[PDB]
Amino acid sequence: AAGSVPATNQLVDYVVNVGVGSPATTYSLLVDTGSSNTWLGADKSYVKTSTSSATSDKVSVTYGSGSFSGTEYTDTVTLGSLTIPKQSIGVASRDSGFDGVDGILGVGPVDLTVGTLSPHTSTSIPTVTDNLFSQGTIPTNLLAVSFEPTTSESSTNGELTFGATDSSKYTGSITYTPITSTSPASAYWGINQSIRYGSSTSILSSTAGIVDTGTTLTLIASDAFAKYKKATGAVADNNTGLLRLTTAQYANLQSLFFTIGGQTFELTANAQIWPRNLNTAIGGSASSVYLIVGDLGSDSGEGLDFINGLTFLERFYSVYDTTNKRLGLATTSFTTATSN
């Protein structure tokens, strides 16, 4: 049947406990819809049991903020009450960028795995979601993710549901949009959207980008980031690497309105800021406002012009539907929270 697993907010990422082997060792894996290789070895050593089997391949993945390489194995993986015999996983001998986690739970589309194995550079690696579905365990090939805002350093306030949605995690109804035809966003959980600030200020004209649980910030193309900095009055900040607003500019901060699937999603002023009681986690000072809208580092028109990251998904329920090749979004009871 469908099944869920709790997920823990670590401010920059979410993790889930994942068992590997029989008997299972638990690893804390980063929930990533922006990549598709499940791997471990960034902290705990890989504990090899009788369900571990070698493959003929090494594995390597390069990310925006890090990388890993190692050797590919098959093993039994457990997610809550769901078990996947013979899940292909990576085991890192090298990794950078993974402080705070054992590795990644790769729930991006399987096409991202092509090229990661050597010498089999054209071979794909079915994901945990794909295997749960093809083995008959979940009734449709889908993952739905609940994130929520946080005021603690580590809060188990999230959920992954494989094979169904959980109506206790969203309000109103889910809006779907097809995966975009525009490359390279089309290789990820890529959608088309536009962004405006307040009632009258365009930020990002309709274009392609991705929805990524494993990107912290809500990133927008550089030309759109300049428009956002102008519209908010924000300035760069040393100590954080985030934009900063004064007290007055936060009081005047308007919503960002995302148009997706013909519907408006409102990322409020409070949703645009880092949780202020946790400002020291990003090098900031207390009673200061830092923004979670960041610069993607590329101009619009490249076919991947935004990343709706963890900070966006703390305010919206998301549905990653492989069977239908679509992405769904809904409001939640926390969309209008003021806890940051």
Binding site: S36, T62, Y63, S65, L112, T215
Partner: peptide, 6 residues
């Protein structure tokens, strides 16, 4: 933060 497989 992080930016996960550009």
């Amino acid at each position: 933060x992080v930016v996960x497989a550009x």
